[model samples]
Target: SWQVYVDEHLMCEIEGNHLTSAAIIGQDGSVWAQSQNFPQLKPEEVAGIVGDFADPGTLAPTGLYIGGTKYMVIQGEPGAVIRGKKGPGGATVKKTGMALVIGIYDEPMTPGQCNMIVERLGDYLIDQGL
Candidate 1:
């Protein structure tokens, strides 16, 4: 699980079947962020600052580190995040853009599951086109 730690302590454990992004605001306020399926969980729970995407129509399907990275994406259905197949040096893809991959489960994920999700999503972003 992409768990964030602060001062050597666990600050949060990423759960939720649809958690598509993550971030951590250190005690000093330095932030380390990542994209995911349900970025809404970021600000509400992680206490990390989030970008204002006031309109859904204007929001991308794939999540991004708004104030952090340049990874942009294309939105999918309500619960989808990007997914990719494994191979080669890393994720194999047709493009290097954004995509959404929906979950196959109906409940909160386990630590192993969250790690897989984040891993694949990163691969999708690195290899697939948006």
Candidate 2:
């Protein structure tokens, strides 16, 4: 399921699920999935991200890249980013429903690369009835 998509189509490594990690937050700030190494987010932090989902147009920056990590929100979903020991590089996103929290690790995933992933993933989710 999610593992297949992340490993195959996204060409990345699956970290974990929402239940275990904060890296993958759901639409309503629910924990969905995450990587073993995912940095935990507090409830307030999650709420902040979820707030963006409530009004994407008001979400500033759109994306962020700092110290090797990247973050972004796409189509009302807190989507895709990078995280790792070498620092972090990949993408994390909340799938439309209670299905899965998508977090992947890839060193080569630059901000642009992650943006493409977010765009593609968002489009795919929408097409699939997310």
Candidate 3:
């Protein structure tokens, strides 16, 4: 099932019908619970997506452009990101440590929406002692 939230508020609960795919990527760029339909993303690809967040100099949390898309990295213990395509379309989730990834492809979430989703998921991960 898919749980949707915005700015820490529960928007609704439903299945991932619009989801194209999803995955859980670790700090070491390892993949877990990956969706079968997800595109084949190599370890290097994962690294490229999260390497900046891993940097010590990256003080504040921010968004990054990777693979021609925009991803908002919520920097913290078990940080997370909502990666979206290059337009008003869906976005996918990824995080540091043991975290989940969700992809909603039908009408991509905006940058603000993506940020909220990452924050909500990050909060959940922290609450669960991630």
Candidate 4:
């Protein structure tokens, strides 16, 4: 079903309470699926991150804002992947052909682990051309 992806896959923690929240969003920022823990992502805020996927320059230096938190970008690839951090927390965003896979994780959860989780699913969907 539609709920299957978020709960069983994206939102499920691999170790610790790593991923505080997660979501799968359409290219236009429409919610395909999002965990209950996901924060309030407004249109303005989402636009900052998803508004322009054509260039990393759009957010690389500007940083990323979501759920009222500002995440300073750590790494970015043009139109494909982005990772950021806020204090001890981290966020990962992966761009598939048709969706954006996102994970917001707190301390005790390494960014790499979160990246692995998000990118795996993202790559799968990308490979499927979804």
Candidate 5:
């Protein structure tokens, strides 16, 4: 069920692709689903990411880190959306009712495309009251 979000929405093939990886995580760092190519995020790292949303100050000096890579984060939609930059690649995170939709993209994909994927899924999850 959750895999469908990754396969169809975040890193879709039929509707064209932009994201290299993606995942759906709870507000408290629960790993509900992740794409096949998603990186292995450690528990502390995941919790840190979750906490960053609540207190944006923690991510001020250092950039956001996924797995082990660093990406500078910029506010996409204030408290709702967060976008990250890492050389030629990028990351986008959107908050839903109780979860976060995160997507990573590189090279051929623009940050806007990655943002669209994550935000759309976040909207869907919000509507579902998830």
Candidate 6:
């Protein structure tokens, strides 16, 4: 879940799994984006997290902690895109999934705004066949 701390009053949380994409829209309707894909931690990344990588769930710690707070990491919708090689008889490469995460530090936002974002993102995911 994206942990949003706006003006130290409103605490907005969008379930990581349910979030397809997230962004902060200011009062002026200007959007600041901080999107992330489904975290695929490499061996190095795992080692940096300070834990036994042997355990599956104990690898990288999901959720963000800000100012003595913890927020969960939700899985986003899986998006599709075409990949191929275009040299001397091109061939398809591979298909994969992706996600988006947005984190911002600024003024507080209304619950209604957060709900609207979640709803629109959910619709987009459904449309993508996630």
Cα deviation of 93, candidate 2, in Å: 5.7
The candidate scoring highest on lDDT is 4
The Cα error of candidate 6 at residue 106, in Å, is: 4.8
lDDT of every model, 2 decimals: 0.30, 0.42, 0.46, 0.80, 0.80, 0.28
Question: Which sequence of candidate numbers ranks them by lDDT, best first?
Answer: 4, 5, 3, 2, 1, 6
In angstroms, give how far residue 55 of model 4 lies from its true place.
1.5
1-70: candidate 6 lDDT, tens digit per residue:
2233221112234343122223322222233332342222233422322222123234225432221223
Pairing residues by index, what is the TM-score of model 3?
A: 0.51
Writing each residue's lDDT as its tens digit, candidate 1 over 46-83 gives 12112212233233334333333223433322223322
**Evaluation by TM-score, superior candidate among 1 and 3:** 3
TM-score, each model?
0.22, 0.48, 0.51, 0.89, 0.88, 0.26
Q: Which lDDT value does model 2 have at 18?
A: 21
RMSD (Cα, Å) for all candidates, in order, is 14.3, 7.5, 6.8, 1.6, 1.9, 16.9
Candidate 1, residue 19: CA error in Å? 6.3
Candidates arranged by TM-score, highest first: 4, 5, 3, 2, 6, 1
Point out the higher-scoring one by lDDT: 3 or 5.
5
What's the lDDT for residue 100 in model 1? 23
Residue range 54-129, candidate 2, lDDT tens digits: 5553434544222234455334333432221224444444444433244443454453444444446545766786
lDDT of 4 by residue, 52-86 (tens): 46756687666888778889988666778888889
